[PDB]
Ligand binder design. Structure first.
Ligand code: 8NM
Length: 108
């Protein structure tokens, strides 16, 4: 699984790339519930996730395989779709970033 984890690190680096920043930036770090004033975020989202946490987990070798890495990336997008109304701008941004992830993750 060392080779598939190098691919996971490559995919995450691509998600942080300048060419995707216009839609990736809300996912770079944890949702700051207090600063944003997000009503009941912690009641609705039991397992928050973001790209910096995923990066820290890859560096600490916490994912034993590609499936575990992919589960955290999809959790990050799922939390966004779950919390927000479907018409929210952040949801449209999550979909664009998920295009990047799914298309590369499938080429594992
Ligand atoms: C994942 N996410 C993130 C934000 C969000 C986060 C931060 N900065 S941060 C990472 O918290 O430090 C800044 C703005 C944010 O809002 C917008 C981002 C773009 C367009 C409209 C809203 C958010 C807000 C409500 N829902 C969400 C959500 O689900």
């Amino acid at each position: 699984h060392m080779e598939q984890l190098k691919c996971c690190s490559g995919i995450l680096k691509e998600m942080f790339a300048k060419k995707h920043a216009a839609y990736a930036w809300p996912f770079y770090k944890p949702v700051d519930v207090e600063a944003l004033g997000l009503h009941d975020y912690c009641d609705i989202i039991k397992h928050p996730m973001d790209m910096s946490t995923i990066k820290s987990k890859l560096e600490a070798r916490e994912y034993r395989d590609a499936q575990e890495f992919g589960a955290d990336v999809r959790l990050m997008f799922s939390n966004c779709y779950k919390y927000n109304p479907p018409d929210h701008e952040v949801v449209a941004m999550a979909r664009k970033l998920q295009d990047v992830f799914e298309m590369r993750f499938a080429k594992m």
